[PDB]
Structure formats: structure tokens, C-alpha cells
Design a binder for this molecule. Structure first.
Ligand code: ADP
Ligand code: MG
Lengths: 454, 592, 50, 455
């Protein structure tokens, strides 16, 4: 192996090694400090007999003359095994649950490879999350990139954990896993997840990668890549249906912003890296499903919109990548709605592939369009009511406003520990459409109405 | 060296991201393509200091370092043009992803795998049409290959070739086989069915022409209010979820063009997979053949190598020029051009260049201006002086929807059509989300004349009146929100309900409805006339002294028929124009 | 009664048009100089590194 | 002699480094000849010791450094002038594009030219009838003046130029303008507009044109407006002709400068533009006017699209500080169907004083415009208050101005692009529009002047 004792200079977190050969871009290294301590690092650029590296833990306390640098001859990898299920890891795949060590089947670059667009297979299958607002109006599809746009204080933690345990695939697939990824979150936030997973037995079905706020910024941006690499392994090599949840994606961008500045890279729009869109796409496009392969990867990235600004670089660029969005509003959180999902700005782009007979029952698409149209009219009539009093309303505007009320309190508000099957969701939807006269349900043909409408 | 001579081999001296520095490239030129590193990843030389070349790599460089060899190819970024290009999915640098898959035996895109764009093995039947001993210049046609039943692939004389046909004959050949011997001043030159061309240099033409013929997209809002001509260029700036991709898919599906070249520039991979699946299953009733037999797909997704985004843009437009020279009307879609500009900014920072606006390089506008200027109505080279055209549709993806973005602005300084998507409308489920107020087309005046002739109706004046109502609606609504609708005149309230009819019954158009996704030119006329005649009769009724509420309450029947009129089949247009009869007879009873 | 309507119009026009146009403008103005400030700061570092 | 070196050190973008040279001068015109045989012109940007940096106009695609050589022509970038130039069209570098016969050039003039000595420069006072009333009367144009058009992308500035170009004739003379047109980075359709319009007004036979389109190299745009202005000062001074200079897009010129500036790693000014933008722009616009003893004249009307529709942007800002006023277009007027959409309030002419009065116009010409200004300023503002607070919220005299302000825009400003108004008709219409006001309110017109011309 290669062990070099010559370090030209150390500046900040960046280190310079001279008299080097056979070193590559993004190659991994190990620093043998004078006190025996071993710190990991990464090659940022290499030219001639010189290589510029960045240390994860930092360069603090290093004596150059008595420290050595070893080049491992491989990029940042992940030891994969089927025994990863039920286990808990850190941002770099190192175990954390203090259980037995894992002998990896093999090692994989966490960068992975890009799926051939030809070889791609359109999502086209339903996933039951349990949450009615999603499973019906903003359906999650196998291989879809469906994110959650939240805010500070908002119960996106409770929503993620709920989906993590409630989400299953119908058709009785004995193989369905959840890869939960935590990015730069506080200690207690991490404990919340790990405790809820164990007590609900969801840990036995999940693989967890936990990264903290005090953790190195590089570890924070490598955490989702460790998670996805496990997912792609479990799905494309072990044929499982893998659901990947990542949060907080805002912490990912702030870390990416820190590292960029650490490497003297010029800021882009609003201070965030000019390659932010591209960098996020290297994460979110890892999802999808491939032709001729059992198994798939579905992602649910959860982020907090800074000052609830959806035009902020983080939620905006995400929306330019993902196949929809689940919007949480504190206006509904104040109302106590659990989960506080506003179905008006929320959207799924591939839901039509997930609805319909065979995957769901036959009235899915019809009730979806009707529940939305009536709610939008109900909410609008409600707003027109408040500004002009309850006198300015028509006879139908009143029942429509009253409709939207039950829609938020009974339909959407289910509870963070209530699992509604898709059948229970759809049946409940009809009991709300019964509030409206049959003549108003223009979005539904009569054959469906004669069959399901009370 | 060691007793034997070989080609010059470079040596990597630096690697950082998509930028590789290599020494001993003395014989190489600028813009020349090269195979970088041990894997031989594709890369383009962009700069040169002494014998050191700065190389722009179109693939991932992770795992590459100094010491590795670099071999040049001699020629610049070029495309293979000939039989086997139609109904194909290419990446940024024109590699068949279909073939890419089978060769590597992998569902994933590796690197260091170079592949011929076209099938050199496949037998094509060439049919000569020119006579021997004929003075052929650059562009002159020598024969053809029926690549598809729909599209005829004409074999033209390559540029820089002028002489006399010596030996030509029909038969089954490959694109590597000589099919014609042209006797030039330099001697004898063999011509095959395939030619190549640098993507960065535009293909030569005789002269440009004014685009005066409007394109039929089947989208009511576009073809009527903000039309685009064949050879014109249109920009579609809008926030995410507004419908940039859907609009561009509609043009690819229904536009009256001979060929469609779709470019997936740094966007979603599923959006390209959606096309290669659905398009071969979309057959127009006349030909018997599918839509995939007129399209050429270029797909460099977002997670695909950033540098290859620019290549995808230049690859598609050059292919579009190739069939333009065949006298065909081509239409190219770029989705999105923003990702192209983002690619330029990435390589700019790596090259330590200076801004520039918003991080983008100073030469951004030029690259854009150079791009759109390659489209238009042209006269292709050759004695025929045949006419061809390229219509450029480009989706711009402004950050946060703000069209103050450099990419949107620079595009608007060279294109005459602007389809502005509104996020507010998209949330109201108002698709296409085109803002009818801010959007514009500088072709509308000329299109109106062409329309007035080909239909014998006053189309221009109908459109003018239609827009005039929509503008009053914007002003009236401001009066509404601070005074109240009840304070409006009955003539004003009529103007509102007519404007409402324009938005919901004409402008709103579902692309996913099997009958509403397309609306023929003649169908657009009837629909607009019906809507306009309702305003005229109601205006007359109000003049006679009728009340607004009476007219409205006594028109529930027709106004619903007007609403559902968009769903009336293309054969039963007589049902739409007959509403004029039912309208004129309904309001006269209201007066009485 | 007539003057109520005049005053009602002014209140409405002031609350719905004037004030929100002010707030949204100062934000877009604040964002501009926020970007302009640091867009120059980066350039200055380039001048510094000559 | 000939001077040629085969020692190219670097080729980076538009810039090229040639070392081991000697006897090279600043701004010297060069010619790169590539290994294939292609000739690409260039200009020396900086020469130190045995080294020299050069900018290549046609670009540096497919250049092999070792096998390419660089010729030093021993003279700056210059234009071959002649009388035969009239009726011809050249490229961005003055090369024939019309397939016309080979021109025997009269002289070779350095396109930078020289600064006109103020003592020799005599004042422009000759009123020009443009046919457009908003220009002729309210923001007067004289010959020898540098009066630009401030427009935006999508706005019809090409029509306003084309209208002026053919409706241009000075009173008290039969002097027909011999215009010169510089196309800078514009598109084919925008160029063909001027082109076609010239062919059916017959002004193509009375003009020389310099074409640089969007498919043409951006670096050529640096020279193009100097090729035009040099040919302008040649025909106007040496040959005593009356030349009208039209340049568009002027914005694309400043874009080209920033491309080279960013390539040279120069210290950037506002928006990345060179710190020497104001000076370089001035070296173009100042190249206009009249001089003692010489009958000829060079009058200049540049066109620039304001980026962001922002008047405070560097390009329209610096231009406004240099030129003698400006003509401004507005989307608000253009959307209102006003032709031409000229917002008369932020526009300006700096030579309207000595320009008009008794002898060249009617004596009311000075008092009418100043009254129309104050009236429109009050009227338009009243209209703003009207659409938000109601027409019944204005005073009786306010509604008189508000009604006046609207009628001002629809007939005075809006006249159509193909209608020629003589200065008399404009003045007559001027009083008609301001007639609908009490005499007591107009405190800016002579009372003896009122009675005589008041309707
Ligand atoms: N013309 C249209 N008709 C119906 N729905 C549309 C239309 N345009 C957009 N949509 C809806 O809006 C969503 C956004 O589509 P897309 O074009 O992918 O957005 P963008 O490309 O602007 O990000 C789609 O999922 C579709 O459901
Ligand atoms: Mg899209």
C-alpha cells in the first residue's frame, strides 16, 4: 500500500500532499496523525506530484512533519449486505446501534451510476401510505420522487415517522423495506425517530442512517448517498420495494453551502452553490424503476421552506426536480389538522399511474377530481363568506363551505397514528360527496354515481 | 521511441471535476475531440497553453488522475447524418442508448464506451435519381432512402464537394458503402449515404426567408392569440409545474411539421422514458404509421454529466438542420435551455472565468443568439433551391418564476414569441397556464392576414375583439375588488361573463383529454365565433332595454352547450356553428 | 351615504392595492441589493487575488 | 515586409498569446492564418517585451498553435473608403456582402478617427422635420445631433427608425439624407425589416450599410459601429454629404466589450461591464455634428434596448449622459395601441432651444411644448387618481386635464408609422388639443401670443 510522509502545507480544512503518484480525483485518504489518531479525507483535485485533500474531522491539532497520508485507492464506499435490515448507521455507514459488526457482501461507490433512460420503466404502481390526503389526492407511486414541503415547528417529523411504519405495498409483497435518512438533525430529533421505530416495530423493516448537527459537514452531504446506495442495492439486486425518506433536506443544502465556501467556490443565487440544482438531481433521480427488474426505489425528501418561502432556492429547485409536492401549512396546523396537508398547492404528477382498477378500486380518479373541485369551491366560498358575512352566500355556497369544513376535520385530519387503508379512504370520500346534491357532481359519470354514492 | 513510431499521446497533468489538463497535445487543435484517461472518457479540447490542453470532459472523471494517457481523435464535435437516425434515442454526444444498453449489457450508463451513432451494418435500399455526368454542387440530391413510410431520407451532396457524377446506381447498401463517384478537380471522391458535420458550426444555406406561415399546434390559446410561424422561435418561461414540458409535448404531437427533434436538456429521465413508450403508440389516421417515425430524441438528463447538456442542444439543432436541407419543415424542442446555461456557468467557474450576469459567463447571450439564429425559413443549398425551415421551441426555467433571469431575458431579445406561464393559473388548474396579458407574439399581425385568406373570415378582427375583452376584464376586476360587482353596469357585467366564457370555454384546454388535446384550425374558428356572437347579441339585447339577469337566466341551455363545445368531434363541427342559430333565437325571446 | 362609499372606496383601494404593492416592492428591492452586495464582494476577492 | 511569426504561445477563448515578437504596436491589425489556410483577422490588445496579446474577431475554432502563424499588418484596424460605397452593403469588418464589383478604395482611414476640435465644431441649429410630431415639436431633432432611441425587447423601435429614415427632410432645402446603417448583433428578421423597407423607398440606392447579425461573431461588433461612423465622417466631411447614422442594437455592442473584458480578467465595473465603458461609448456618439467651412453634416440616431426595461441600467444610463437627449419607448403606451409609443415625459432633446423659434418655425413653438408638458404632467397624474378613486373624486378642472391627457396620447402621440405630419400641422393640432382649457390656467404662454394663435 501507499504511505506518504510528505505534507507540503495545511490551510484551514484543506491539506496539500507532495511527491505523490497514482492518486485520483475524489480518491479517499487516511491521515495518520502524530498522536496515532486516524482522520479520513477526500481528494478535491490532483495535479502532477501534488494532491489537494480535505479532512472530514478537520486539520486541527495536526503536526505536518510527523503525520502521514495514506491513499486508499478507492472513493467513498459503502459495505452492503442483506443484514443491514434492522440496523442503524451513522452518516458514513459506520454502525451505531452497538450491535454485531457486518461482513459486507461487497462495496459500492455511493455516487452510484445513472439509469439508462431507455432502460427506465415508468413508475405505474400504487403505494399505500395510510394518509388519506396522499393515498387519494396526491398518490405516491413506486419509483416517484414525492417531497414534503414543511416549515419550522410543523409536524413533518410526525408525518415522516407515520409513513415510515404505515407505508406498505398491497398485493402481499413479502419484501418491502424503508431506508430512513437523517441529515444534520439535533440529538433529540434523532432519538425521536429511533425510539418510535423500535416501539412500533418499524425498525425490523427499516435501515436507518442517522446524521447529527454537530457532525462534520461532509458527512452531512454524504449521508443521503449512503442511504440511496443501500436502497439501490436492496431494490435492484435483492428485488425489494424500497421507500427512502430523507430529512431535513434544508440541512443538506446548508452543509453543501458550507463546504462550497470552504473550497473557496463562488456563491450562486441567494448564496447557495450554482450547482445546487444539479447536485440535488444526483440524489432525487436515483429513484425510479428499471425494466426487467423486480424491485424499485421511491423517495420522499422532506424539507423546511425557509420563512415558508416556496420561491427559496431549496424548495424551488427541488420542485424543478421532483414529481410533485406535499405542502404542510401552519394555518392547518393551528387548526389541529393531522397531518396539516393543504391539498390545493399539493400535487402528484404521476398519480394517474397509481390510481385505477387493479391497483386501487375503479372510482379513485373520479372522486379525486370531484373532492378537489368541491373543496376549492368550498374554501373559496368560505373565504367569500367571512369577508361578506353568511348572508352573501347562496344555498349551495353554504353547504359547500360546510363541506370543506368536514373535509379538513374528518377526511384529512386522521391522526398521526391512524392507518387508513385505501378502501377506507375512498369510502369516506363518498360520505362527504353525499353532502352535495347529485346534480353538482359534474366530474363524475352516472354509472359510478349509481354504484357508490349513498 | 524504442525503435518504433506511433501517434502522439498526451499525458494528464491535472484533474478537477469536468476539467482535465493534459501535456504533450502539440498536434491537437482547439475544439478537437479526445479520449481522456485509461478508460478513454470522451472529452473536448477548449483551451491551449504551450503543449498543454485544457479538456472539457463530457463524462464523469471520478477515479481519474495524472499520468494517464490522452489520445486525440482529430475532428471536432460532430454528428453522423444518414439512414438510421429516425426513431432513435440519443444522449448528448449522439450515442444510441438502445444500443448502449445491449453492448454494455447494463441498465446503467457507464463510461469509456464509444459507439457509432448509426447502424453501419443495416442494409438500406438506395434509389438513385440523378443522371450520370451531371454537375452536382453542394446540397444537390443524388437519390433517397425510404427510412420510414412517412419520411423520405434524401441523400445530398456533402459540403465542399463539387464535380461530376461518374458512377451511380441503385441497390441495397450500407452507409459505409460507396454509392456515387464524383469527379472533382482534386480527383475522384467516393460518396456514401452518411455524412458528418461539426455541431458547433451551423450548416450552410443559400439565404434566409421571413417566416410568414403559422404553425398548427392544435392549442387554442396559442394558434389564436399568440401564434408561432414555421421558422419562428418561441420561449416558454415558467415556474415548476406550470406546464413547460406538457406544452412542448403537445407541439411534438400535433404540429403540422415533417419532423420533430426533442431535446431533453438536463431534465427528468422519466419525461424521456414517457416519450419513447407513448409516441410509438400514437398513430395519425392518414399515414397508418406512428408518431415515433418522424421524431428524433436527444436525452441528457439532469443527473447525467453536466458538460454534455450543451452538446445535447447543439446535437439536436444540427440534426434539425440536416433534414431542413432536405426541404422538410422541422421543429426542435429544447427542455430546458436553463440547464444549458447552468452548464455554461459550471464550466465557467472551473475555468476561473469572470462574470458575467448572475454567475453566468459574459458570452451567454451570444451562445443563445447564435443558437436561435440557426432556425428560420431558409433556402437549402442546391440547384433545386428547395425551401426548408426550423421552428425552435425552448423552455426556460426561471428561478422562482422571476423572468428577470438572464436566460429568459437574453432569449426574449432574439425571439418574437413569448408564452409566459403563470403559477397562479396553474394552481387554479387553468391549463395551458399561459398568461394572456403578459404573453405576446410579434407574428400575430402577419398570421392574421394568412388566416383571413385561408378561411375567408375576419379572423384577425375576431382575435382582436377577443383580446380586447380579456383586457377590459383585467381592469374591471380591479374595480370589482374595491367597489363591488353590484356597482357595475349591466354592459360591464356582460363583458365579464363573455370574458369568463373566453377563459373557461376556449383558453382552458386539457392536454390529457382525447378530444380536447387537439383543436383543428376550422374548429377553433367556430368555437370563437359562437363565443363572440353571444356577446354581440347580448350587447344588442341590452341596447333594446333587456336586463342582464334575464339574459343570463334565460341562457343556461346555450351557455352549457358553448362550454361543452370543446368536446365536439372534428367531424361534427356543424353542431358547433349551429349554436349561432340557437343563440340568436334565444335572446330574441328574452326581449319579448 | 354618498360620502361613505367614497371613503369606503379609498379604504379598500388603500388596503388592497397601495399597501400590498408597497410591501412586495420593498422585498424585491431588498433582495436586489442583497444580491448586488455579495455579487460585488466575490468580484473584490478576485481583485484581491490578482 | 511581410511581418509574420510562427510562435503562438496560448489560445484561450477569443484571446491569443504570441511571443518572441518584436516591433509590434498597440491596436495593430493582425491576421491569423491557420494550418488549413483560413485567414482570421485580429487586433493587438496589449504588447509587453517580446510578447503580445491579440483578440481574434472570427473566433479561435480549430486552431493548431504549433502549425499556425500570425501576420502583423503594421497598421491599425482601418476602413477602405470610397464614393462607390453608396448603394453597397458590407459585413461587420467592411467586407462586401452584396456580390458587387471590387471597390477601388480611395483612402484607408483608421476607424478610431480623431476628436473634433471644439473651435472648428460649429453648433447644430438646423431643425429637422421627421414627420413624427412627438419628435419634431416636443423633443426637437436637428442635423448634427446625437439623439438615441431608448427601447426594449419586443418594442417596435425598428419601425420608428424606419419611419424617420424615409420621412427625414430638412425645411428650407432640397438636401436628401444619405443614411448609413450599422447592424449590430441583431436577428435576420429585424435586419430584413430595414432592408426591405429601404428597397421600396429606394433609399438603398442612397445608402451604405454595415451588417453584423446574430450568427456573426460577437467580437466583430466592437469594430462595426466604428466602420459606420468612419464612413459617415468620410462622406459628410471629405465629400460634403448629409449623413444620417442609424445603429442597432447599441446594447449588443456593450455586450461584446464585456466579453473581451471578462476574457482579459480586467477589473469589472457595474454589472461586469468594463470600467472604460463611458469613454468607449463616448468615442462613438461624440463623432457627430457640423464643422466650420464644411457644408456636410453627420447626424446620429442610435438604438438601444434597455435591459430589464431599466433606465438606470449602465448602458442606457451612460448613453443618456453622453448623447444630446433621448427618445424613450414604453410598453404601457405600446400596449395601448399608441404608434409610436413615445413617452414624452422622460424623453429629452438638448438642442431644441437654438433649434426652433422664429425663422425656422412659428414663434409659438417654444411656448406650446412647455405648456403641453405641464398639462400632461398634471393630466396623466389625475387619470391615475381617477381609475382608483373614481372620476367623481376629481375636481372639474382635473377631469378637464384627465380628458386632455388621454386625447393627448391617442392623436398627438399616436399618428401611425406611415403618416407624415409637417411641422405646421403639428403646431395647429397642438393648439386644438390644449384649446379645451381655460386661459387663466395657462401661465406659460405669452398673452399676446395666445390671442393670435388661440382657437
Ligand atoms: N396543457 C395542460 N393540460 C392539462 N394539464 C396540464 C397541462 N400543462 C400542465 N399540466 C399539469 O401540470 C403539471 C406540470 O407539467 P410539466 O409540463 O411537467 O411542468 P413543468 O415542465 O413546467 O415543470 C402536469 O403534471 C400536468 O398535470
Ligand atoms: Mg418539465
Amino acid at each position: 500500500i501507499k504511505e506518504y510522509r510528505t505534507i507540503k502545507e495545511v490551510v484551514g480544512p484543506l491539506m496539500a500532499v507532495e511527491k505523490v503518484s497514482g492518486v485520483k480525483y475524489e480518491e479517499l485518504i487516511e491521515v495518520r496523525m502524530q498522536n496515532g489518531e486516524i482522520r479520513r479525507g477526500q481528494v478535491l483535485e490532483v495535479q502532477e506530484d501534488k494532491a489537494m485533500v480535505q479532512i472530514f474531522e478537520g486539520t486541527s491539532g495536526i503536526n505536518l512533519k510527523n503525520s502521514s497520508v495514506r491513499f486508499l485507492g478507492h472513493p467513498l464506499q459503502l459495505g452492503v449486505s442483506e443484514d443491514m435490515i434492522g440496523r442503524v448507521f451513522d452518516g458514513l455507514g459506520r454502525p451505531k446501534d452497538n450491535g454485531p459488526e457486518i461482513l459486507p457482501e461487497k462495496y459500492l461507490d455511493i455516487n452510484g451510476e445513472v439509469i439508462n433512460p431507455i432502460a427506465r420503466d415508468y413508475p405505474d404502481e400504487f403505494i399505500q401510505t395510510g394518509i388519506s390526503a396522499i393515498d387519494h389526492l396526491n398518490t405516491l407511486v413506486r419509483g416517484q420522487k414525492l417531497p414534503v414541503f414543511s416549515g419550522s415547528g410543523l409536524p413533518h417529523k410526525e408525518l415522516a415517522a407515520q409513513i415510515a411504519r404505515q407505508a406498505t405495498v398491497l398485493d402481499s409483497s413479502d419484501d418491502f423495506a424503508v431506508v430512513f435518512a437523517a441529515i444534520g438533525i439535533t440529538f433529540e430529533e434523532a432519538e425521536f425517530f429511533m425510539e418510535d421505530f423500535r416501539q412500533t416495530g418499524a425498525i425490523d423493516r427499516s435501515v436507518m442512517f442517522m446524521n447529527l448537527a454537530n457532525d462534520p459537514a461532509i458527512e452531512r452531504i454524504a449521508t443521503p448517498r449512503m442511504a440511496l446506495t443501500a436502497a439501490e442495492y436492496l431494490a435492484y439486486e435483492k428485488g425489494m420495494h424500497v421507500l427512502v425518506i430523507m430529512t431535513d433536506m434544508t440541512n443538506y443544502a446548508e452543509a453543501l453551502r458550507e463546504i462550497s465556501a470552504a473550497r473557496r467556490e463562488v456563491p450562486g443565487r441567494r448564496g447557495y452553490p450554482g450547482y445546487l440544482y444539479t447536485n440535488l438531481a444526483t440524489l432525487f433521480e436515483r429513484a425510479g424503476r428499471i425494466r426487467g427488474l423486480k424491485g424499485s426505489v421511491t423517495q420522499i425528501p422532506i424539507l423546511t421552506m425557509p420563512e415558508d418561502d416556496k420561491t427559496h432556492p431549496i424548495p424551488d429547485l427541488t420542485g424543478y426536480i421532483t414529481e410533485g409536492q406535499i405542502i404542510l401549512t401552519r394555518e392547518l396546523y393551528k387548526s389541529g389538522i393531522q397531518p396539516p396537508i393543504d391539498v390545493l398547492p399539493s400535487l402528484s404528477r404521476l398519480k394517474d399511474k397509481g390510481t385505477g382498477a387493479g391497483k386501487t378500486r375503479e372510482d379513485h380518479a373520479a372522486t379525486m377530481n370531484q373532492l378537489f373541485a368541491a373543496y376549492a369551491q368550498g374554501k373559496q366560498a368560505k373565504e367569500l363568506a367571512v369577508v361578506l358575512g353568511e348572508s352573501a352566500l347562496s344555498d349551495i355556497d353554504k353547504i359547500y363551505a360546510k363541506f370543506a369544513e368536514r373535509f379538513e376535520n374528518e377526511y384529512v385530519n386522521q391522526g398521526f397514528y391512524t392507518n387508513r387503508t385505501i378502501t377506507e379512504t375512498l369510502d369516506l370520500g363518498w360520505e362527504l360527496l353525499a353532502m352535495l346534491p347529485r346534480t353538482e357532481l359534474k366530474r363524475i359519470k352516472d354509472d359510478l354515481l349509481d354504484k357508490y354514492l349513498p | 521511441s524504442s525503435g518504433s513510431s506511433g501517434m502522439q499521446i498526451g499525458k494528464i497533468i491535472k484533474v478537477s471535476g469536468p476539467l482535465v489538463m493534459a501535456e504533450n497535445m502539440s498536434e491537437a487543435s482547439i475544439q478537437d475531440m479526445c479520449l481522456v484517461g485509461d478508460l478513454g472518457v470522451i472529452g473536448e479540447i477548449i483551451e491551449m497553453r504551450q503543449d498543454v490542453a485544457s479538456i472539457q470532459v463530457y463524462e464523469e472523471t471520478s477515479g481519474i488522475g495524472p499520468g494517464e494517457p490522452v489520445r486525440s481523435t482529430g475532428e471536432a464535435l460532430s454528428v453522423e447524418l444518414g439512414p438510421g437516425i429516425i426513431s432513435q434515442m440519443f444522449d448528448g454526444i449522439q450515442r444510441p442508448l438502445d444500443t448502449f444498453m445491449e453492448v454494455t449489457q447494463s441498465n446503467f450508463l457507464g463510461r469509456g464506451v464509444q459507439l457509432p451513432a448509426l447502424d453501419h451494418e443495416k442494409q438500406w435500399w438506395f434509389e438513385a435519381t440523378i443522371e450520370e455526368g451531371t454537375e452536382v454542387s453542394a446540397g444537390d440530391i443524388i437519390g433517397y432512402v425510404d427510412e420510414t413510410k412517412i419520411i423520405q431520407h434524401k441523400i445530398m451532396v456533402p459540403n465542399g464537394i463539387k464535380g461530376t457524377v461518374q458512377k451511380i446506381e441503385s441497390g441495397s447498401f450500407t452507409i459505409d458503402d460507396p454509392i456515387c463517384v464524383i469527379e472533382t478537380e482534386q480527383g475522384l471522391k467516393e460518396l456514401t449515404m452518411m455524412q458528418k458535420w461539426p455541431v458547433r458550426r451551423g450548416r450552410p444555406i443559400k439565404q434566409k426567408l421571413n417566416p410568414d406561415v403559422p404553425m398548427i399546434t392544435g392549442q387554442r390559446v396559442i394558434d389564436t392569440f399568440f401564434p408561432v410561424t414555421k421558422g419562428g422561435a418561441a420561449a416558454v418561461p415558467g415556474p415548476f409545474g406550470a406546464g413547460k414540458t406538457v406544452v412542448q409535448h403537445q407541439i411534438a404531437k400535433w404540429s403540422d411539421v415533417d419532423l420533430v427533434v426533442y431535446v431533453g436538456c438536463g431534465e427528468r429521465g422519466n419525461e424521456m422514458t414517457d416519450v419513447v413508450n407513448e409516441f410509438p403508440e400514437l398513430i395519425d389516421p392518414n399515414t397508418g404509421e406512428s408518431l415515433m417515425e418522424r421524431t428524433v430524441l436527444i436525452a441528457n438528463t439532469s443527473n447525467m454529466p453536466v458538460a454534455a447538456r450543451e452538446a445535447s442542444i447543439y446535437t439536436g439543432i444540427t440534426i434539425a438542420e440536416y433534414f431542413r436541407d432536405m426541404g422538410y419543415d422541422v421543429a426542435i424542442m429544447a427542455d430546458s435551455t436553463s440547464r444549458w446555461a447552468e452548464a455554461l456557468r459550471e464550466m465557467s467557474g472551473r475555468l476561473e472565468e469572470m462574470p458575467g450576469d448572475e454567475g453566468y459567463p459574459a458570452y451567454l447571450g451570444s451562445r443563445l443568439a447564435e443558437y436561435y439564429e440557426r432556425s428560420g425559413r431558409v433556402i437549402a443549398l442546391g440547384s433545386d433551391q428547395r425551401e426548408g425551415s426550423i421552428t425552435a421551441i425552448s423552455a426556460v426555467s426561471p428561478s422562482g418564476g422571476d423572468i428577470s433571469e438572464p436566460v429568459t431575458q437574453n432569449t426574449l431579445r432574439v425571439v418574437k414569441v413569448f408564452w409566459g406561464l403563470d403559477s397562479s393559473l396553474a394552481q387554479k388548474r387553468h391549463f395551458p397556464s399561459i398568461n394572456w396579458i403578459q404573453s405576446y407574439s410579434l407574428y400575430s399581425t402577419e398570421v392574421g392576414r394568412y388566416m383571413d385568406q385561408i378561411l375567408q373570415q375576419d379572423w384577425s378582427d375576431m382575435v382582436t375583439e377577443g383580446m380586447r375583452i380579456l383586457q377590459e376584464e383585467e381592469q374591471l376586476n380591479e374595480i370589482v375588488r374595491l367597489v363591488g360587482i353590484d356597482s357595475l353596469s349591466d354592459n360591464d357585467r356582460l363583458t365579464l361573463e363573455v370574458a369568463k366564457s373566453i377563459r373557461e370555454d376556449y383558453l382552458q384546454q386539457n392536454a390529457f383529454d382525447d378530444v380536447d388535446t387537439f383543436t383543428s384550425r376550422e374548429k377553433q374558428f367556430n368555437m370563437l365565433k359562437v363565443i363572440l356572437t353571444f356577446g354581440k347579441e347580448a350587447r344588442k339585447a341590452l341596447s333594446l332595454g333587456a336586463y342582464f339577469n334575464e339574459i343570463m337566466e334565460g341562457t343556461v341551455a346555450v351557455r352549457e352547450r358553448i362550454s361543452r363545445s370543446k368536446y365536439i368531434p372534428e367531424e361534427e363541427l356543424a353542431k358547433i356553428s349551429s349554436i349561432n342559430e340557437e343563440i340568436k333565437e334565444t335572446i330574441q325571446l328574452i326581449v319579448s | 351615504a354618498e360620502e361613505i362609499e367614497k371613503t369606503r372606496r379609498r379604504v379598500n383601494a388603500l388596503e388592497y392595492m397601495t399597501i400590498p404593492q408597497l410591501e412586495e416592492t420593498i422585498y424585491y428591492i431588498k433582495m436586489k441589493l442583497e444580491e448586488n452586495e455579495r455579487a460585488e464582494v466575490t468580484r473584490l476577492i478576485k481583485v484581491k487575488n490578482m
